[PDB]
Design a protein around this nucleic acid. Sequence first.
DNA 1: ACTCTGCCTCAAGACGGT
DNA 2: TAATTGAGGCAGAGT
DNA 3: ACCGTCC
Length: 341
Amino acid sequence: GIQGLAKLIADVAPSAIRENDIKSYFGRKVAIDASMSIYQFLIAVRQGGDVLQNEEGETTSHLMGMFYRTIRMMENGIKPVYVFDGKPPQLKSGELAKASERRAEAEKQLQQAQAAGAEQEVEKFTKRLVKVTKQHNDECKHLLSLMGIPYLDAPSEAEASCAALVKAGKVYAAATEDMDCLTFGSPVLMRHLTASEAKKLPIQEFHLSRILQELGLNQEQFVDLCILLGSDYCESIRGIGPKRAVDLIQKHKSIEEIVRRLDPNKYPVPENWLHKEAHQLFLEPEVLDPESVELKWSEPNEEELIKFMCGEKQFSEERIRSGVKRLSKSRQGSTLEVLFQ
DNA sequence: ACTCTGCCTCAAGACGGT
DNA sequence: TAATTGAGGCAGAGT
DNA sequence: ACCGTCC
Ligand SMILES: [K+]
Ligand SMILES: [Sm+3]
Ligand SMILES: [Sm+3]
Ligand SMILES: [Sm+3]
Ligand SMILES: [Sm+3]
Ligand SMILES: [Sm+3]
């Protein structure tokens, strides 16, 4: 993500944040960062500090949420396409190594609480070690196929390919919490689109054109702003936060110019700073071709979903059948069958 | 006064009967 | 064979 | 809407 960008928008560019009722999105298509939704379910969907699972010990929390949340979206006429990450870019390797440190230390502190018969400490580092695996992604892809819900494999970061689907008009918005989707150029970003019966947070749209207008920037200047704020791909400047970062971009436009005019003794830049390379990655990321695959929402295969979710993963047959019926009727009401001419 | 850093914590789902 | 993110809150120090 | 339960 971008450190503090959502807060900056809310304070400087509030006009870019628009809220609408779930009832207004009937018929709209959205792109979803699948990995983040899977992670949300593995973290939250716990029963007694442990995850849901079948008797074979195979985890099912990700299948639980993917199934029901996706159905709820379709009942509201919202048609999602799930986008899965691919090979991370090299620039992320500098940050990937720093993540393993946190997992290594979280593992060290895990067995410590275990050998110490702790209770709340076990549930503390356990959730901190959660991670989305290839088997998590493959099982969700398998589920979506049976549900008739489309998905796409991005060549690199899913966030970037979601944005490219919006640019191309193949979906209305990227439904995510990772604000760096705007840094990748997404015209629209939607938060809090869960279609949950609770309705605790309002559906927010972030319109990039509004952000650029109220900040007085173009896209390249907005990317440099996000770099100074803090991105996954390179270092920021120590002592330059969201307040000074805005004033500098608005005044000097480019980081290259900010360095020329900054006092090297007062605000020294990082050593071997890759702000140019991250700039190139945000503006011209490796993305799928939106014109290659035509997004279709298809009839779900009920009998295979029962065999998979119930026979194998041990979901309630009554609940799964009911879910597939809802999914099939809601698709019939929001989706036109294919026509030939 | 304003701003930034480095700490700290906390939460992160959904169904169906009541 | 995976590497969130986000939001606040607080004290303390730099501008 | 609350809350035990989901697997
Ligand atoms: K910084
Ligand atoms: Sm990201
Ligand atoms: Sm099995
Ligand atoms: Sm990602
Ligand atoms: Sm990241
Ligand atoms: Sm089995």
